[PDB]
A paper describes a structure:
DrMoaE structural data with a resolution of 1.9 Å were obtained, revealing that each monomeric protein consisted of three α helices and six β sheets. The α/β structure exhibited a hammerhead fold containing an additional four-stranded antiparallel β-sheet domain. The r.m.s.d. values of 1.19 Å and 0.981 Å were comparable with the Cα atoms of EcMoaE and MtMoaE, respectively, suggesting that DrMoaE was similar to its homologous proteins, with a high degree of overlap of the four-stranded antiparallel β sheet, but a displacement of the α1 and α2 helices located around it. The anion pocket of substrate precursor Z (cPMP) bound to EcMoaE was found to consist of His103, Arg104, and Arg39, which corresponded to His109, Arg110, and Arg45 of DrMoaE, respectively. The His109 and Arg110 amino acid pair of DrMoaE located in the α3 helix was equally capable of forming an anion-binding pocket with the Arg45 of β2 sheet located in another monomer, which matched well with the MtMoaE protein, but exhibited a significant angular shift in E. coli. When the corresponding Arg110 in D. radiodurans was mutated to alanine, the gel filtration result of DrMoaE shifted from a single peak of 34 kDa to a single peak of 17 kDa. The DrMoaE dimer disappeared, suggesting that Arg110 had an irreplaceable role in the stable dimerization formation of DrMoaE. In conclusion, our results support that DrMoaE possesses a conserved MoaE protein structure, with a more disordered loop between the β2 and β3 sheets, while the cPMP-binding pocket Arg110 residue is a key site for its dimerization, which responds to the oxidative damage process in D. radiodurans, and is thus able to reduce base damage and genomic DNA mutations to defend against various external stresses.
Molybdenum ions are covalently bound to molybdenum pterin (MPT) to produce molybdenum cofactor (Moco), a compound essential for the catalytic activity of molybdenum enzymes, which is involved in a variety of biological functions. MoaE is the large subunit of MPT synthase and plays a key role in Moco synthesis. MPT synthase is a heterotetrameric enzyme composed of two small and two large subunits encoded by moaD and moaE. MPT synthase catalyzes the conversion of precursor Z (cPMP) into MPT via sulfur transfer of MoaD thiocarboxylate.
Author numbering:
A (entry chain A): 9 to 145
B (entry chain B): 10 to 145
Write the structure that this text describes.
């Protein structure tokens, strides 16, 4: 009830995250959104194919949320990752954290994005003109 | 590349997102501050926010320029709301888009801490302890 962790093919929405996180007792919400970038360090990309097994990815998310709470205290946590072929400027991940005060929310969001970049079992194939290749990045 | 506004109308995350997202900016970081109840152990009925709108928007644009000095290329969105705001209503929204994630996250964090100090915005929380306006 204080945590939302979902892997989905549907578009990710900040407004849905906001609808879940904001409560009168939580004066602060901090977000991160990752979207597909069109010149990736001097390379032109037209799509990225994301793969995730929802049960294993969501179990990682819920463990991430509990680690964030261990470090930063009371939180509401929103984590979603999108699957499928994603065109540029389309969101692949949304992370949102609400807390009584701003500094815990900012730190918890920061922790989650760095933690999930390491621990999330996501596999992706980028369209660089260099064939199909699936990487755990 | 920069949007800075003081308004009495509701603040919108989805409006910030519409302004920020561009194909070359793969990362966006946001902060929203909402009216908190209870606060310091007492129920808050509302917070009256008052701002010198032209002065405050100039501070916002200088803050966005300082953010770029430290973190490079950015799209920056800053809005602050004025008037009588009830619990869970947003008083400030900050959004930053950058090519990569570290500058977006740290620039957003920089902006909220910077603006907490420099914004000419005065508030009065109605927490039942009389009138008391604070630069907070």
């Amino acid at each position: 009830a204080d945590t939302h962790c979902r892997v989905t093919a549907d578009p990710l929405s900040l407004s849905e995250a906001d609808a879940f996180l904001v409560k009168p007792e939580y004066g602060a919400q901090a977000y991160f959104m990752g979207t597909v970038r069109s010149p990736n360090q001097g390379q032109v990309v037209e799509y990225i194919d994301y793969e995730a097994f929802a049960p294993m990815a969501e179990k990682v998310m819920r463990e991430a949320a509990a680690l964030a709470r261990e470090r930063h205290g009371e939180l509401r946590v929103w984590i979603e990752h999108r699957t499928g072929r994603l065109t540029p400027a389309v969101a692949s991940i949304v992370i949102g954290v609400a807390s009584p005060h701003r500094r815990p929310a900012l730190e918890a969001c920061d922790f989650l994005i760095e933690h999930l970049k390491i621990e999330l079992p996501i596999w992706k194939h980028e369209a660089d003109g260099r064939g199909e290749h699936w990487v755990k990045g």
